[PDB]
Ligand binder design. Structure first.
Ligand SMILES: CCC1=C(C)/C(=C/C2=NC(=C\c3[nH]c(/C=C4\NC(=O)[C@H](C)[C@H]4CC)c(C)c3CCC(=O)O)/C(CCC(=O)O)=C2C)NC1=O
Ligand SMILES: CCC1=C(C)/C(=C/C2=NC(=C\c3[nH]c(/C=C4\NC(=O)[C@H](C)[C@H]4CC)c(C)c3CCC(=O)O)/C(CCC(=O)O)=C2C)NC1=O
Ligand SMILES: CCC1=C(C)/C(=C/C2=NC(=C\c3[nH]c(/C=C4\NC(=O)[C@H](C)[C@H]4CC)c(C)c3CCC(=O)O)/C(CCC(=O)O)=C2C)NC1=O
Ligand SMILES: CCC1=C(C)/C(=C/C2=NC(=C\c3[nH]c(/C=C4\NC(=O)[C@H](C)[C@H]4CC)c(C)c3CCC(=O)O)/C(CCC(=O)O)=C2C)NC1=O
Ligand SMILES: CCC1=C(C)/C(=C/C2=NC(=C\c3[nH]c(/C=C4\NC(=O)[C@H](C)[C@H]4CC)c(C)c3CCC(=O)O)/C(CCC(=O)O)=C2C)NC1=O
Ligand SMILES: CCC1=C(C)/C(=C/C2=NC(=C\c3[nH]c(/C=C4\NC(=O)[C@H](C)[C@H]4CC)c(C)c3CCC(=O)O)/C(CCC(=O)O)=C2C)NC1=O
Ligand SMILES: CCC1=C(C)/C(=C/C2=NC(=C\c3[nH]c(/C=C4\NC(=O)[C@H](C)[C@H]4CC)c(C)c3CCC(=O)O)/C(CCC(=O)O)=C2C)NC1=O
Ligand SMILES: CCC1=C(C)/C(=C/C2=NC(=C\c3[nH]c(/C=C4\NC(=O)[C@H](C)[C@H]4CC)c(C)c3CCC(=O)O)/C(CCC(=O)O)=C2C)NC1=O
Lengths: 247, 160, 66, 162, 162, 162, 160, 162, 160
């Protein structure tokens, strides 16, 4: 006979049985595959405009698709930004200034600033320029104040001159969806924003953040650690009483 | 996959696949049967490969299966050889896919953090993968050995 | 005024990057006037050295037309 | 998105199985049709402007109200948006035809499309008719063998919108 | 965020009141427990990697299917994300214990976490058992009083996720 | 945004119709009220700071609780936020008056404003009262002729919140 | 060429060429002689191809050589046939390169603006290059004709 | 970047010439060297890390003051940056060898390298010596036939830095 | 150090230091003297620390100095002990600075790449740092041991 038992490492790696509904769900469960099935466009070459022309035009059109969410050929976007493209080919400016000129353009303002309230403006421009939704209440306050007091272009430049843009995208890469893991609620809000087609909805995804200043109940004064604290302060008070004269 | 990679590249550019990418897909599709034969050959002899790779590894690194080692005991050695089985399956997946994308997406991204949480030696993983490469490329011919060792080399470089 | 032409080196200290980055280390860039205070502040913060900046577009001392 | 090969890989990975006879059979079936798929893709890419040309002509002949005032396709801007959408459908159907899998359609075309069209006021039935017109033109151009297998993805898009 | 000191300050600021004897008593209680809180935070920080080691080991022992092929913790990437989430929970629970208040938990962990995990097919119940595994491991290291203290914030995360 | 002239243009463009007598009548009406609108806008530009001063003073006099401890407008930050909201409302109501159309109000102010105020706990009734205070001050400054027109946009904003 | 595109693809994610790209280069250099033969065939017969394509173009689009047409007159017809010669030379360059990059970099980037400044109808160009495709693929065998028709079709689509 | 084929294409494009016998001879010469170039590239891809290890060891043996304190390569960061530069030199020399033309070196590697090294204090002579040591190490592995060809591009790199 | 980190944090918001931040700096400069004594004690006994740590490492990990190991050979053992000397000097720097910033920016960024180029096994480095911590904490008192072992634990985690 020479019975040959099934090796243990076979069963150590077996999966539960799964029909088609569970197989489909198991394939598509975690973070969306768009996170890795994508290209990131950066001006890796400092070479002249004469060579690598096609790569550089691909970068330009990727920047258009990132700032305006799609191709804007009907709006003759190429001739509007012709001088800008010429400067970026001649390496007079970097990718970040190209993005700054597209995001501060009149076309961008008509597409994403004029149609929406300032909160939606903050979240849309943060999606287009930082790759994420509005992060917390402090960021909403900061950009709301800029929009209220200085308007649209200082708002765009405040986003683009922030340290976060410099750390993530620097001066050479076109922005992209970041799939941010931190902080809390950034990931789902960002996914909601980036799973939306252009003009899919006019609703504000993140109107504001509900304050955590006051909860209802759970004073935490009954906590046994705090109870021990009130126990020990009593002993301290008793000692202070004892250092008084006995009479 | 080559087809997936070309389609992703074309879609990131909002264009149709150029004649160059279609020629790449042509070449990939033509070589499909040979790669399928290599993957079938690896699949038919998985138990032999895993057992021999484990024997070579534990001869080379007896500490892992000595008491106090990571893979000491029948169950832990079973888990070790199960890891090797996982990576052999990913090697066959990459062979049919034509690139290291299955290996990278399943067993490479975050492998160091995972094995650090498992207190599993990364060098030992490297010798285990090298043993797998030797045993598997032994079964193949001269031409197929280079292609399969490419995937094994990528995975071993990913480990350390 | 309205334009500076900036040549600055920005070294890397936090990490050694897998990509080339010889896009972003040594460069010459055109930056508009109201941009330069913040921009220079940024290059100073990542530890870069400003090698030179020049007037290109406008004329110094203008009271309007800036 | 998934092609046929990565679809097989994903199923066998989530099941934790090595490739069996069925998996190799499916991979061989995909490799056998790859030549057909590549020629169809090249022909469509060379004739894409012509396909959209004829299909939009057919759609606006059958539904003259779309481009006359009061129609969703009445303006230069909205007409351009409509033909741009038909270019979208043709390009992504060609992608799904090369990949041999409708996965990219769900991931990158149909996601939020019905409700985007509803919010915009785009008539979905007319869009389905335009997709059918593109199906007919493409099938005429690329030959029957590629015609049926392009029609599969055109029907997938139509049913997803419908 | 908000700590115990800031909690007293905000309570008296909403009333527009200078501090009373009760406020000083609460502040003295927090100052009394500050040293125990610092010791617990230090011993947790020194042993955080070990706590994650054991907690993940217990969770994947009790629920093997999570790390079997097709499970939500089956890939090197998804397993890494799992242990990263556990380290997140441990770090923020240490933050909350050091602060003496749970407002940081609601603000920076639980806000959007349930629908984060539901959009990802992460098993929320399994995450809850991972949190109890961290609770049990941490309690044995920090000592009885600090164990009862850390348990409050661990149970807060467990209840917010549940 | 949309104004009265562009509204007439859009109405006649959708019908594919040249301008008839009624269209010219509406255009004449807007051109006739144009100089009054321009004078009102210039006055509001001149006195916007004073308008916000007096409107906020009136609102906080009628509702002293808002700026005392425990009120939604009690802090320097929340007081500044209240004044910034009222500045928004005044400027955009001025825009809507100068346009002769409330579309800019819907598409830059009211969309999501109720959700923002409900998320923050901002009292809607008191914001409406502040808008009424702005309405009274602005109507007093602009004069009887433009007060009725300006109150239309202030009332539109108040009804949009309430 | 194919080598250049493989190299830039490697530089995109910064690693040495994979065995797939090396096999692609090997197949390309192996097929060098046949594509040089194709280029010779299309080059020695340049005049016949240009004349037949121009005659077919003027038959199918007589308004070009009619009064008020862009190619009306002897000089303008000469310029028309000259552009046809340009594009035939670019097709031979692309055949030798193994891809369409020479055609793009010499005659597609900015062709739309260039022909707009010249009042040259782009449909006329498309039909002209389709006629040139037919005339050129008539001279070749089936395997070579398919490869050449790929470049011709891609040029026609680029002009469209 | 341009390879030998694109170089011939460009030199016949600037003259407005169809390919003649001379161009065909040059193309045949490149196609003849193609298999040797592919073999060398594959060999270097197999042994890139080994080559860099041996060449860096040789360089720091010849000039040990580089890695001692006060040298340009003294830290983990600066030593890593040195071996990373060596990696770039080897990989781009392999690229240029495969293309058969040196334009990629000037286009990507040698543009601004001189100024960046001088302004960062990186010594040019030691980098040239490292490139040389790379050249001898690579020549032994590739084989005598490919050794001279790869030495051409290594010498181009050094002379550009020299 | 702590002063530098505070200054950078304030310059991020373009503001002078808060009273609490100045209090933090006051506490730092108050602890500076005890930190100086601790670093003095560590720097005085550097020779014995290096000797004991190297001996303990080589007894725990004989394969390093055994034939075939990276540390085998007189010169290679000298290089190993020299690396230990570097890391002890860096630990003293971190102790005087009050933070791990000098430690990281001399010997943690790129350490994995350097030791990968040097064939140096990372677990060997981790064990060297652990034995070195044991010796150093043995020579120091109870109070100093905690903060001194803190930087060694940080360094070991960096290597691990
Ligand atoms: C600071 C508060 C906070 C938390 C906690 C948080 C968690 C979080 N977990 C995520 C994914 C995930 N989370 C887990 C966690 C595991 N799944 C297993 O079944 C276990 C039951 C469970 C832990 C014990 C897994 C497996 C993924 C999938 C990662 C992927 O698909 O790549 C994601 C999506 C983005 C990413 O993966 O980087 C987030 C944002 N985000 C936050 O802002
Ligand atoms: C498909 C991608 C993938 C991989 C690779 C993977 C590895 C992996 N190995 C594990 C355990 C293990 N892995 C090993 C293997 C080690 N033993 C020796 O030291 C060797 C150096 C080395 C193998 C050659 C061992 C011994 C265990 C048991 C650990 C324990 O139970 O404490 C675990 C914990 C869950 C379980 O035991 O089932 C995972 C997730 N998981 C994945 O989803
Ligand atoms: C892709 C083409 C390319 C190359 C090759 C290149 C070289 C290069 N090496 C650098 C770092 C470095 N490179 C070295 C290595 C040098 N010093 C030693 O003495 C050695 C002899 C010699 C290496 C053979 C060192 C020591 C540094 C760190 C310099 C510092 O920032 O202090 C830097 C600064 C950016 C960074 O730190 O990452 C550049 C630009 N740059 C490019 O854009
Ligand atoms: C309100 C903005 C707007 C415009 C301008 C517009 C133009 C327009 N012209 C069309 C047809 C046409 N338009 C023309 C006009 C051309 N014939 C000659 O070449 C001339 C040079 C030129 C006119 C001066 C022709 C010939 C057709 C018929 C095309 C065909 O059926 O193939 C069509 C297709 C539907 C139809 O037949 O009605 C549109 C949409 N549509 C709009 O919504
Ligand atoms: C590839 C994935 C994808 C799809 C499918 C897509 C569809 C899409 N079509 C749009 C507009 C449009 N689409 C149409 C098409 C309609 N016109 C006629 O009625 C027809 C029946 C019908 C088309 C056959 C029209 C008229 C508009 C303009 C709507 C407007 O601006 O008012 C928009 C709004 C933003 C924009 O124009 O860029 C989207 C998002 N977007 C995408 O990113
Ligand atoms: C907790 C943070 C906080 C502060 C500080 C605050 C100040 C504050 N002071 C106010 C009035 C006032 N405040 C002052 C005080 C100024 N006049 C003099 O010149 C001095 C320079 C200066 C005081 C030293 C005066 C005179 C008024 C009356 C103004 C008026 O009646 O119009 C008001 C208007 C509402 C009211 O009077 O109840 C506020 C909100 N509110 C807050 O929520
Ligand atoms: C242009 C359209 C638009 C508006 C108007 C708008 C208002 C707005 N008001 C806000 C906060 C606020 N708004 C108010 C004002 C209200 N509470 C007071 O008691 C008054 C009764 C009343 C004003 C008359 C207050 C007090 C806050 C602060 C709430 C908080 O931070 O908790 C915020 C959050 C950002 C920040 O605090 O700076 C927004 C976005 N957003 C928009 O996109
Ligand atoms: C201050 C920051 C810094 C560090 C850390 C550093 C490490 C370092 N160690 C080196 C050699 C070495 N280092 C070691 C040490 C290893 N041998 C055993 O395996 C041990 C596990 C381990 C030491 C504990 C060995 C054996 C060599 C010789 C490598 C060789 O020559 O092949 C070298 C090559 C240059 C030379 O030998 O002079 C460097 C750069 N250099 C720096 O500028």
């Amino acid at each position: 006979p020479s019975f040959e038992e099934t090796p243990k490492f076979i069963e150590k790696g077996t999966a539960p049985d799964r029909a088609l509904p569970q197989i489909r769900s198991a394939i598509n469960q975690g973070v969306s595959k768009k996170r890795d099935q994508r290209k990131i466009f950066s001006t890796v070459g400092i070479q002249t405009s004469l060579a690598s022309r096609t790569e550089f035009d691909a970068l330009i059109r990727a920047a258009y698709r990132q700032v305006f969410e799609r191709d804007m050929d009907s709006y003759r976007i190429t001739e509007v930004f012709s001088v800008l493209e010429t400067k970026l080919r001649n390496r007079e400016i970097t990718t970040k200034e190209f993005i700054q000129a597209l995001a501060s353009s009149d076309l961008y303002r008509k597409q994403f600033f004029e149609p929406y309230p300032p909160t939606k403006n903050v979240e849309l421009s943060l999606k287009h320029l930082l790759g994420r939704a509005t992060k917390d209440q402090a960021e909403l306050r900061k950009y709301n104040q800029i929009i209220a007091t200085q308007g649209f272009k200082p708002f765009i430049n405040a986003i683009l001159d922030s340290k976060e843009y410099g750390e993530v995208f620097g001066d050479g890469t076109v922005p992209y969806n970041r799939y941010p893991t931190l902080p809390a609620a950034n990931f789902p809000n960002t996914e909601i924003l980036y799973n939306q087609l252009t003009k899919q909805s006019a609703e504000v995804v993140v109107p504001s953040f509900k304050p955590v200043t006051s909860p209802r109940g759970m004073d935490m004064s009954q906590t046994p650690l705090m109870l021990q604290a009130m126990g020990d302060i009593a002993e301290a008070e008793q000692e202070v009483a004892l250092q008084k004269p006995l009479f | 996959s080559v087809v997936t990679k070309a389609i992703v590249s074309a879609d990131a550019e909002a264009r149709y696949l150029s004649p160059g990418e279609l020629d790449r897909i042509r070449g990939f599709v033509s070589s499909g049967e040979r790669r399928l034969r290599v993957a079938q050959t690896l699949t038919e002899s998985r138990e032999r490969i895993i057992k021999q790779a484990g024997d070579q590894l534990f001869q080379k690194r007896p500490d892992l299966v000595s008491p106090g080692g990571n893979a000491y005991g029948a169950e832990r050695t079973a888990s070790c050889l199960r890891d090797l089985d996982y990576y052999l399956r990913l090697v066959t997946f990459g062979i049919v896919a034509g690139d290291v994308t299955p290996i990278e997406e399943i067993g490479v991204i975050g492998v160091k953090e995972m094995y650090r949480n498992l207190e599993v030696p990364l060098p030992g993983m490297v010798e285990a993968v090298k043993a797998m490469k030797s045993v598997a490329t032994g079964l193949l011919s001269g031409d197929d050995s280079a292609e399969v060792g490419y995937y094994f080399d990528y995975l071993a470089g990913a480990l350390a | 005024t309205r334009l500076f032409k900036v040549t600055a080196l920005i070294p890397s200290y936090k990490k050694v990057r897998g990509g080339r980055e010889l896009q972003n280390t040594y460069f010459t860039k055109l930056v508009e006037y109201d941009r330069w205070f913040a921009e220079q502040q940024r290059i100073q913060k990542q530890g870069g050295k400003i090698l030179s900046v020049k007037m290109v577009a406008g004329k110094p001392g203008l009271n309007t037309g800036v | 998105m998934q092609d046929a090969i990565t679809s097989v890989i994903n199923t066998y990975d989530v099941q934790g199985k090595y490739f069996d006879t069925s998996a190799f059979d499916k991979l061989k079936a995909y490799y056998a049709t790859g030549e057909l798929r590549v020629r169809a893709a090249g022909t469509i890419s060379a004739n894409a402007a012509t396909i959209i040309k004829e299909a939009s002509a057919k759609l606006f002949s059958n539904q003259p109200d779309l481009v006359r005032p009061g129609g969703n396709a009445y303006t230069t801007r909205r007409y351009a948006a409509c033909v741009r959408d038909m270019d979208y459908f043709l390009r992504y159907a060609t992608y799904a035809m090369l990949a041999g899998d409708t996965s990219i359609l769900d991931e990158r075309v149909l996601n939020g499309l019905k409700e985007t069209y509803n919010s915009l006021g785009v008539p979905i039935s007319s869009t389905v008719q335009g997709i059918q017109a593109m199906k007919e033109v493409t099938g005429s151009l690329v030959g029957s063998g590629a015609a049926k297998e392009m029609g599969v993805y055109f029907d997938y898009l139509s049913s997803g919108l419908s």
